[PDB]
Amino acid sequence: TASLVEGVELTKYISDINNNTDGMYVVSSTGGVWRISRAKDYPDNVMTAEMRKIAMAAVLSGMRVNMCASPASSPNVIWAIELEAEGSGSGASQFFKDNCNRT
Amino acid sequence: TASLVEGVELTKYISDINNNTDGMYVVSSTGGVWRISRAKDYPDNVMTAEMRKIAMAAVLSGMRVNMCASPASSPNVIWAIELEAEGSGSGASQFFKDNCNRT
Amino acid sequence: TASLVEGVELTKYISDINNNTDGMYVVSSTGGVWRISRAKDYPDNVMTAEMRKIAMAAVLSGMRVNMCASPASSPNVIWAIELEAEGSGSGASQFFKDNCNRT
Amino acid sequence: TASLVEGVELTKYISDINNNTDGMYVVSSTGGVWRISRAKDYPDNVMTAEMRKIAMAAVLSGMRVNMCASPASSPNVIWAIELEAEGSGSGASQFFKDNCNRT
Amino acid sequence: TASLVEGVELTKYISDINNNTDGMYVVSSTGGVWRISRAKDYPDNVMTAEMRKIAMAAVLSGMRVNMCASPASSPNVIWAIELEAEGSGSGASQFFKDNCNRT
Questions:
Q1: What region, left, alpha or beta, does residue B31 occupy, with left being phi > 0 and alpha being psi -120 to 50 degrees?
Q2: Which residue in D10, D56, D18 sits closest to E98, CA to CA?
Q3: Cα–Cα distance between D78 and D76 in angstroms, integer?
Q4: Measuring CA to CA, how many Å separate B36 from each of A7, A14, B72?
Q5: Burial, E37: exposed, middle or buried (Cβ in 10 Å; 0-12, 13-18, 19+)?
């Protein structure tokens, strides 16, 4: 049921510690809102941290992303993300599609 | 009571260990002074880490920020911060505003 | 059997906490999929952190890498990455070639 | 006796793990040399980390920094630093001159 | 028996977790090879980390370094490093020079 989103331009990066709305969020050029995952323990805290790095990276640089998201929230929750440099003819990678065409 | 500040251009980043006045601080083009939140434990240490990350990116590159600030202290504390790209975006995002106007 | 792959251009960088696929992955302009290595404890958490930084950096800039990946599985796990600025003709360092060819 | 140095251009940055000489230092264009404070605990370990990040930012990009250092030892220890975007360049923020003219 | 190295243009940043060759390495344009120092505990875990940030910045930007490395072992491990700009020379700072003739 995991949803693939492709070629998102992230334009807004949000840190928020207000209760009932804490966590990190991104906003798409078209106003898609997603929440970034989070994790205390190894090994996901590695990946959730790199989610934050990647997300910042796009908003700062204009770079595109590809998201494996859950439309079982609102804002949705980013379950995996791919950062892509300019000059890539294709959008998402085949390896990235396949992994989310599974959960 | 939370304030909402928009299209702030941050010009300065301050680290301070002098007694009382210790913490992180950002100063806007208009001379406005805010204090970056902090926390020791999971999960907010992540958000306040990214909060520190966003304040530098803004300062180092000039991108605009939107903040949910508590006016209850001087300088005001930052409770949420939204880093926004030069692709405009109509100022602050609705997702941000919605959560600043809800406390 | 750890092979040496020279002069890669990486165009995608992937965080993923999908179960049974969770990890860091890099993709070449050509499609090659690799899995960044991962480690909990000192001293290799410092190294896997630095390939993560090296992965991200090659993605953002376009500078080549040279890798030392294990063909033992798919995608090939990365055991030793080496970044390189645009000097000479993007060759792999003799030091790195040799250390790679000793497993 | 705390001192306020303004508009400094940091052109060098030293990590050094040789005994007693160990610690982190910055050097201006004039050869003036300062020492970054250290701390092991929350929250000052946040602020000293941000101090180091500021110092590396200036050196890399040659932006100026204002410093609040303690003359009681040599090199001076930085008790507060302020990284400033190129543009305002009006000296230090009033806020930062006022916190160091009270210790 | 420590040995100052000045004006070193680093061209290659290396992470490696292969057994009996793991660590962090840098390589100069001429082809010289140093190990980056590692450390687990406070405070050298701060200095070693900055050491690694300094490499991830000179390889990236072409900025020159100065080194104090121990010839006591294979790829002489770096005991101190100075990230500098290219203003005029630059040389090394006297502060750095005077710290190196120590061990």
A1: left
A2: D18
A3: 6
A4: 33, 14, 14
A5: buried
Contact yes or no for A46 and C56 at CB 8 A:
no
Q: Note whether D54 and D47 are within 8 A (CB).
A: no
| A14:B63 CB<8 A | no
Nearest to B7 by CA among B50, B56, B51, B63: B63
Instruction: Please indicate if any CB of chain C lies within 8 Å of the CB of A79.
Output: yes
Nearest by CB to B13, from D37, D42, D83: name it.
D83
Chains adjacent to B (≥3 CB pairs closer than 8 angstroms):
A, D
Residue A40: both structure tokens together: 């205390």
Token digits of residue D52: 């180091």
Q: Structure solved using which method?
A: X-ray
- Encoded amino acid at C21, one letter: T
Q: What domains are defined for chain B?
A: 3-100 (2.40.50.50)
For D30, residues 6+ apart whose C-beta sits below 8 A from its C-beta are none
Characterise D96 by phi-psi region: left (phi > 0), alpha (psi -120 to 50), beta (else): alpha
Q: Is the torsion defined by CA of A63, A68, A74, A75 positive or negative?
A: negative
- Secondary structure letter of residue C92 according to DSSP: P
Q: Is D67 left (phi over 0), alpha (psi -120 to 50) or beta?
A: beta
Angle at B98 between CA B62 and CA B72, to 5 degrees: 75
* Omega before residue E75 within 30° of 0, cis: no
**For residue E44, which of B80, B63, C42 has the smallest C-alpha distance?**
C42
- What is the experimental resolution, given in Å to one decimal place? 2.7
E70-98 core/surface letters (b: 16 or more CB in 10 A; e: else) = beeeebbbbbbbbbbbeeeebebbebbee
Q: To the nearest whole angstrom, how far is the Cα of D12 from the nearest Cα of chain B?
A: 19
Rounded (5°) CA angle D13-E58-E3: 65
What angle (nearest 5°) sits at the alpha carbon of residue B76, between those of residues B45 and B94?
75
Query: B13 near D96, Cβ under 8 Å?
Result: no
Q: Residue D70 and residue C103: Cα distance in Å, rounded? A: 53
Instruction: Find the radius of gyration of the CA atoms of chain C.
Output: 13
The answer to whether D38 and E43 are in contact (CB under 8 A) is: yes
